[PDB]
Amino acid sequence: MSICTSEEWQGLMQFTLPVRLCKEIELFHFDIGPFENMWPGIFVYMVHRSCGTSCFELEKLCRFIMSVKKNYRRVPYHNWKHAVTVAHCMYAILQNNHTLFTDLERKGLLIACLCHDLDHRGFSNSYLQKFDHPLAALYSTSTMEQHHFSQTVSILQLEGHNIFSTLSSSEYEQVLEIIRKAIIATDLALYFGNRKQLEEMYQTGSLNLNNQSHRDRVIGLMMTACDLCSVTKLWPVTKLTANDIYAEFWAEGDEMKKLGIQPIPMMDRDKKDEVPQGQLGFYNAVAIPCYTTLTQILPPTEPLLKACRDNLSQWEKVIRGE
């Protein structure tokens, strides 16, 4: 476990945000990349704007963030920058659907996003499972997600870190569940079933947001939507990130090789030609449907779908030499 120093959050409480960004965070395609220094501050801004200033305890929040920060590894993809990006997509969905969600749901969904990949190694579930690695035996399914949540909790169990103290033991235990379920939903295995169910539910007319089971399923889709949002950015950003993903996918497949296993096309660095054919598969199979159902459920999220289409169009172009 890694704790933030004394004078990191104190100088971060000093943090104020420039006007130009204030007006641009609100945008779905907004890219946080150009503002590394400013990332902790931006989350806070997003919290405040969505949850309220007097609402969260400030000393605690700032300690919480820099400790979340320091427990993200320096891996190519699933790092501190993934976290804030994913957090940002949430804020964008939330802002456009603010009232649909309660003040606890919004509190918890934003904190969950930031924490959803905590202590990621750059290794997939399947890897840790087909091998072991103690984590696949401790958490048998949704291996890494279960770790991610656990770590969130450990971070909350630190001196001055428990931002949720000021809640009622009723609310406190409610929000830990919203998080747990949220962090778990980002296991992409679940997503496929969850979308069809939701597809089904919307298509028949059954979907009801007062239904806690329905609700949970909707929140699920949101988490998938955010965890993937880099496919919703402008093309050059989108393309750069794919490098980082693969950087990890390959380092993984290499270790499969290193210990006598033959990795799929997607984690085979000698198979870089098939990538754009895989990306097209992934957009069509996974991302397009994901943002499609989500737009039906929540119409203020159609922009996310467009961005994704546009990016699919680009991938098609790479395939045909252009």
Least Å distance, CB 223 to Zn ion, is 9
Q: Which does 248 bind (CB under 5 to 8 A by kind): Zn ion, Mg ion, none?
A: none
* Secondary structure element (H or E) that encloses residue 253, with its range: helix 235-258
**How far apart (Å, rounded) are the C-alpha atoms in residues 52 and 38?**
20
Question: Is position 48 annotated as part of the catalytic site?
Answer: no
Can you say whether the dihedral through the CA atoms of 40, 300, 148, 155 is positive or negative?
A: positive
Tell me if 227 is assigned to a ligand binding site.
Answer: yes
List the x/- string, 73-112, binding to Zn ion by CB under 5 A. ----------------------------------------
Tell me if 95 is assigned to a ligand binding site.
Answer: no
Identify which range of 104-112, 113-121, 230-238, 262-270 contacts Zn ion by CB under 5 A: 113-121
The residue within the footprint of Zn ion, chosen from 117, 145, 248, 252 (CB under 5 A), is: 117
Nearer CB in complex with Zn ion: 117/119: 117
Tell me if 88 is assigned to a ligand binding site.
Answer: no
Which residue is nearest to Zn ion, using beta carbons? 227
Nearest Cα residue to 290 out of 311, 277, 300, 305:
305
**Binding to Zn ion by residue 227, rule CB under 5 A?**
yes
Tell me if 279 is assigned to a ligand binding site.
Answer: yes
CB atoms within 10 A of CB 171: 15
Nearest Cα residue to 222 out of 70, 93, 135, 74:
93
In the complex, the residues that contact Mg ion under the rule CB under 5 A are: 117, 186
**How far apart (Å, rounded) are the C-alpha atoms in residues 252 and 127?**
8
Q: 3-state SS of the chain: helix, strand, coil percent to 5?
A: 70, 0, 30
Nearer CB in complex with Mg ion: 75/201: 75
Nearer CB in complex with Mg ion: 117/248: 117
Tell me if 78 is assigned to a ligand binding site.
Answer: yes
Nearer CB in complex with Zn ion: 75/156: 75
Least Å distance, CB 231 to Mg ion, is 15
Least Å distance, CB 69 to Zn ion, is 16
**Binding to Zn ion by residue 145, rule CB under 5 A?**
no
Task: Write out the two tokens for 305.
Answer: 């779908």
Q: Dihedrals φ, ψ of 161, to 5°?
A: -95, -30
Q: What's the DSSP call for residue 286?
A: I
Nearer CB in complex with Mg ion: 151/301: 151
**How far apart (Å, rounded) are the C-alpha atoms in residues 67 and 9?**
10
Q: Which residues contact 1 (CB under 8 A, 6 or more apart)?
A: 71, 154, 155, 158
Nearest Cα residue to 222 out of 101, 78, 76, 307:
101
**How far apart (Å, rounded) are the C-alpha atoms in residues 182 and 101?**
14
**Binding to Zn ion by residue 248, rule CB under 5 A?**
no
Least Å distance, CB 4 to Mg ion, is 22
Give yes or no for a contact between 321 and 297, defined as CB atoms under 8 angstroms apart.
no
Nearer CB in complex with Mg ion: 31/117: 117
Count residues near Zn ion (CB under 5 A). Answer: 2
- The catalytic position among 29, 48, 78, 214 is 78
Least Å distance, CB 227 to Zn ion, is 4
Q: Say whether 181 sits in a helix, a strand or coil.
A: helix
Least Å distance, CB 212 to Mg ion, is 24
Q: What's the one-letter identity of residue 272? A: K
Catalytic residue list: 78
Q: Which residues bind Zn ion (CB under 5 A)?
A: 117, 227
Binding residues: 78, 82, 116-117, 227, 279
